[PDB]
Amino acid sequence: RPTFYRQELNKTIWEVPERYQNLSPVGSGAYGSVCAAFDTKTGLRVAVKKLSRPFQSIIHAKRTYRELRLLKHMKHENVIGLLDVFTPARSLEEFNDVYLVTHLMGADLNNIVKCQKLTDDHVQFLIYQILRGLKYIHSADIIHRDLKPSNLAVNEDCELKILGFGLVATRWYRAPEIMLNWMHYNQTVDIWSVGCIMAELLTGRTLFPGTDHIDQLKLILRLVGTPGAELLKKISSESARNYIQSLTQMPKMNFANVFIGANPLAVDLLEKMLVLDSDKRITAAQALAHAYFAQYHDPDDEPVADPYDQSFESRDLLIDEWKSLTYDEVISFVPP
Ligand SMILES: Cn1nc(C(C)(C)C)cc1NC(=O)Nc1ccc(Cl)cc1
Ligand SMILES: CCCCCCCCO[C@@H]1O[C@H](CO)[C@@H](O)[C@H](O)[C@H]1O
């Protein structure tokens, strides 16, 4: 066991191993608060997140366990993973606080889009890394469901990691079937989001800046056109059908025109991502093999995940059970 020291940072007591020096608040945090720290073992600056009421309720407790399970599993260059996890608690009886340690990235993609005029090469590299992480995430049977610029961490090298918890958002990036509810969806909900992100990096404009869920659907249809018969048949909802069909039939736009000036290989890929029919959307694995990424794609360096046990997602457990399982995950942790 490490020696711990305590320090008040913005009205809470942080208690961390002496390994972690010079804690400096960098943001928050739905969910938690994050400091930058100097890792004396490695000589690298890291992110330390103190969780924030991790066992408040059953929902918090399960979210907490999910953090430990996800982050201990994620082992990929373009996906957030765990450098360390600790608690000052000796024994389960005392177990109340959880700290996560991960790479300190310094900026998110929203910061980059708003400041920098990105070249085509930047868009190639950035989207390539997202798709590479996403291939890995999807191979573990995980759907992100909230891919957006603020959930994408980027360093000065333009290296990128996908995160689940941010610090533009969120309905702008959301697949149409999610806002129709549907239930009940596939992995390509994430591919829709990638298309929205990619479009935005190319043009410097939000592709579908809806004011609400209903405006969002309008804007999507403007671009992609009214669904054909084979798609309209699948919509159970009468009011969704009336809304869709009452929009005075929209012709699919010429993506060539909407994205004029863009690399035509970028446009071709966007057409394959931003398809209404989620069955017909390109997968992450297929997208990596698209010609747009010819300069980056290496089929021998786009790995998949070890199988991931998320049967826990099924369970309705008590707080102390989630807590005890989380505690077990903290104790069994082996660093990279
Ligand atoms: C909820 N969640 N889902 C994922 C994916 C799907 C990307 C594995 C990752 C996460 N969780 C996080 O992104 N958690 C997290 C922890 C510490 C910091 Cl400093 C920032 C973020
Ligand atoms: C803007 C409103 C247009 C409606 C979008 C149509 C969505 C089509 O995507 C649908 O997704 C479902 C859930 O994964 C699947 O069960 C269907 O097979 C698939 O066709």
PDB file of N, CA, C and O in Angstrom, residues 111-137:
ATOM      1  N   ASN A 111     -12.489  22.042 -29.071  1.00  0.00           N
ATOM      2  CA  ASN A 111     -11.418  23.038 -29.016  1.00  0.00           C
ATOM      3  C   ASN A 111     -10.670  23.195 -30.341  1.00  0.00           C
ATOM      4  O   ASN A 111     -10.365  24.312 -30.753  1.00  0.00           O
ATOM      5  N   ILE A 112     -10.390  22.072 -31.004  1.00  0.00           N
ATOM      6  CA  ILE A 112      -9.653  22.072 -32.274  1.00  0.00           C
ATOM      7  C   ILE A 112     -10.492  22.644 -33.438  1.00  0.00           C
ATOM      8  O   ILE A 112     -10.003  23.496 -34.186  1.00  0.00           O
ATOM      9  N   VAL A 113     -11.744  22.190 -33.575  1.00  0.00           N
ATOM     10  CA  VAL A 113     -12.651  22.663 -34.647  1.00  0.00           C
ATOM     11  C   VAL A 113     -12.905  24.173 -34.565  1.00  0.00           C
ATOM     12  O   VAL A 113     -13.025  24.841 -35.594  1.00  0.00           O
ATOM     13  N   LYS A 114     -12.991  24.694 -33.340  1.00  0.00           N
ATOM     14  CA  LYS A 114     -13.353  26.094 -33.103  1.00  0.00           C
ATOM     15  C   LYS A 114     -12.194  27.066 -33.301  1.00  0.00           C
ATOM     16  O   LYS A 114     -12.412  28.235 -33.638  1.00  0.00           O
ATOM     17  N   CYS A 115     -10.972  26.572 -33.105  1.00  0.00           N
ATOM     18  CA  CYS A 115      -9.758  27.374 -33.275  1.00  0.00           C
ATOM     19  C   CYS A 115      -9.120  27.188 -34.646  1.00  0.00           C
ATOM     20  O   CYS A 115      -8.964  28.154 -35.402  1.00  0.00           O
ATOM     21  N   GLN A 116      -8.772  25.944 -34.964  1.00  0.00           N
ATOM     22  CA  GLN A 116      -7.939  25.640 -36.122  1.00  0.00           C
ATOM     23  C   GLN A 116      -8.712  25.437 -37.410  1.00  0.00           C
ATOM     24  O   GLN A 116      -9.801  24.844 -37.423  1.00  0.00           O
ATOM     25  N   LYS A 117      -8.135  25.954 -38.491  1.00  0.00           N
ATOM     26  CA  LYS A 117      -8.592  25.656 -39.835  1.00  0.00           C
ATOM     27  C   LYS A 117      -7.866  24.362 -40.227  1.00  0.00           C
ATOM     28  O   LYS A 117      -6.659  24.371 -40.508  1.00  0.00           O
ATOM     29  N   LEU A 118      -8.607  23.249 -40.192  1.00  0.00           N
ATOM     30  CA  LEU A 118      -8.043  21.911 -40.405  1.00  0.00           C
ATOM     31  C   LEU A 118      -7.889  21.587 -41.877  1.00  0.00           C
ATOM     32  O   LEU A 118      -8.826  21.757 -42.661  1.00  0.00           O
ATOM     33  N   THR A 119      -6.711  21.102 -42.246  1.00  0.00           N
ATOM     34  CA  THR A 119      -6.480  20.607 -43.597  1.00  0.00           C
ATOM     35  C   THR A 119      -7.104  19.207 -43.790  1.00  0.00           C
ATOM     36  O   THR A 119      -7.495  18.536 -42.817  1.00  0.00           O
ATOM     37  N   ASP A 120      -7.180  18.775 -45.044  1.00  0.00           N
ATOM     38  CA  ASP A 120      -7.692  17.455 -45.382  1.00  0.00           C
ATOM     39  C   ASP A 120      -6.886  16.332 -44.724  1.00  0.00           C
ATOM     40  O   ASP A 120      -7.441  15.277 -44.387  1.00  0.00           O
ATOM     41  N   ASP A 121      -5.583  16.559 -44.551  1.00  0.00           N
ATOM     42  CA  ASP A 121      -4.728  15.557 -43.927  1.00  0.00           C
ATOM     43  C   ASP A 121      -5.072  15.364 -42.449  1.00  0.00           C
ATOM     44  O   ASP A 121      -5.002  14.240 -41.935  1.00  0.00           O
ATOM     45  N   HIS A 122      -5.424  16.465 -41.786  1.00  0.00           N
ATOM     46  CA  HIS A 122      -5.855  16.436 -40.399  1.00  0.00           C
ATOM     47  C   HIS A 122      -7.162  15.672 -40.263  1.00  0.00           C
ATOM     48  O   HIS A 122      -7.319  14.881 -39.346  1.00  0.00           O
ATOM     49  N   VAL A 123      -8.088  15.912 -41.182  1.00  0.00           N
ATOM     50  CA  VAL A 123      -9.371  15.219 -41.139  1.00  0.00           C
ATOM     51  C   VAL A 123      -9.153  13.718 -41.373  1.00  0.00           C
ATOM     52  O   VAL A 123      -9.742  12.890 -40.683  1.00  0.00           O
ATOM     53  N   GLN A 124      -8.266  13.374 -42.312  1.00  0.00           N
ATOM     54  CA  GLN A 124      -7.923  11.977 -42.562  1.00  0.00           C
ATOM     55  C   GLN A 124      -7.423  11.307 -41.311  1.00  0.00           C
ATOM     56  O   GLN A 124      -7.893  10.215 -40.969  1.00  0.00           O
ATOM     57  N   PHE A 125      -6.467  11.955 -40.642  1.00  0.00           N
ATOM     58  CA  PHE A 125      -5.790  11.371 -39.477  1.00  0.00           C
ATOM     59  C   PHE A 125      -6.764  11.239 -38.297  1.00  0.00           C
ATOM     60  O   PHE A 125      -6.861  10.172 -37.681  1.00  0.00           O
ATOM     61  N   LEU A 126      -7.492  12.324 -38.017  1.00  0.00           N
ATOM     62  CA  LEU A 126      -8.462  12.370 -36.922  1.00  0.00           C
ATOM     63  C   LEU A 126      -9.582  11.333 -37.048  1.00  0.00           C
ATOM     64  O   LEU A 126      -9.825  10.570 -36.116  1.00  0.00           O
ATOM     65  N   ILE A 127     -10.246  11.308 -38.206  1.00  0.00           N
ATOM     66  CA  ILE A 127     -11.349  10.367 -38.409  1.00  0.00           C
ATOM     67  C   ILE A 127     -10.821   8.942 -38.402  1.00  0.00           C
ATOM     68  O   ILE A 127     -11.438   8.073 -37.784  1.00  0.00           O
ATOM     69  N   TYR A 128      -9.658   8.725 -39.037  1.00  0.00           N
ATOM     70  CA  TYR A 128      -9.001   7.412 -39.033  1.00  0.00           C
ATOM     71  C   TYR A 128      -8.838   6.870 -37.607  1.00  0.00           C
ATOM     72  O   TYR A 128      -9.180   5.716 -37.334  1.00  0.00           O
ATOM     73  N   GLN A 129      -8.314   7.710 -36.706  1.00  0.00           N
ATOM     74  CA  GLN A 129      -8.127   7.320 -35.300  1.00  0.00           C
ATOM     75  C   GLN A 129      -9.457   7.031 -34.592  1.00  0.00           C
ATOM     76  O   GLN A 129      -9.548   6.096 -33.794  1.00  0.00           O
ATOM     77  N   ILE A 130     -10.488   7.816 -34.901  1.00  0.00           N
ATOM     78  CA  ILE A 130     -11.812   7.575 -34.293  1.00  0.00           C
ATOM     79  C   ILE A 130     -12.319   6.211 -34.733  1.00  0.00           C
ATOM     80  O   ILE A 130     -12.816   5.429 -33.917  1.00  0.00           O
ATOM     81  N   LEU A 131     -12.222   5.939 -36.035  1.00  0.00           N
ATOM     82  CA  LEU A 131     -12.725   4.697 -36.604  1.00  0.00           C
ATOM     83  C   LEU A 131     -11.925   3.513 -36.080  1.00  0.00           C
ATOM     84  O   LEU A 131     -12.483   2.456 -35.834  1.00  0.00           O
ATOM     85  N   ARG A 132     -10.619   3.722 -35.889  1.00  0.00           N
ATOM     86  CA  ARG A 132      -9.729   2.682 -35.359  1.00  0.00           C
ATOM     87  C   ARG A 132     -10.113   2.336 -33.913  1.00  0.00           C
ATOM     88  O   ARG A 132     -10.207   1.164 -33.571  1.00  0.00           O
ATOM     89  N   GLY A 133     -10.374   3.350 -33.090  1.00  0.00           N
ATOM     90  CA  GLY A 133     -10.834   3.113 -31.728  1.00  0.00           C
ATOM     91  C   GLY A 133     -12.208   2.469 -31.728  1.00  0.00           C
ATOM     92  O   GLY A 133     -12.470   1.546 -30.979  1.00  0.00           O
ATOM     93  N   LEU A 134     -13.082   2.970 -32.593  1.00  0.00           N
ATOM     94  CA  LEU A 134     -14.432   2.472 -32.709  1.00  0.00           C
ATOM     95  C   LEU A 134     -14.495   1.004 -33.157  1.00  0.00           C
ATOM     96  O   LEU A 134     -15.284   0.227 -32.619  1.00  0.00           O
ATOM     97  N   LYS A 135     -13.686   0.627 -34.143  1.00  0.00           N
ATOM     98  CA  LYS A 135     -13.545  -0.799 -34.496  1.00  0.00           C
ATOM     99  C   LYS A 135     -13.277  -1.661 -33.251  1.00  0.00           C
ATOM    100  O   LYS A 135     -13.908  -2.694 -33.055  1.00  0.00           O
ATOM    101  N   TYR A 136     -12.338  -1.220 -32.418  1.00  0.00           N
ATOM    102  CA  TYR A 136     -11.976  -1.921 -31.183  1.00  0.00           C
ATOM    103  C   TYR A 136     -13.172  -1.955 -30.209  1.00  0.00           C
ATOM    104  O   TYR A 136     -13.557  -3.024 -29.700  1.00  0.00           O
ATOM    105  N   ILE A 137     -13.761  -0.785 -29.958  1.00  0.00           N
ATOM    106  CA  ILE A 137     -14.939  -0.668 -29.076  1.00  0.00           C
ATOM    107  C   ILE A 137     -16.093  -1.594 -29.541  1.00  0.00           C
ATOM    108  O   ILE A 137     -16.652  -2.380 -28.749  1.00  0.00           O
TER     109      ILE A 137
END
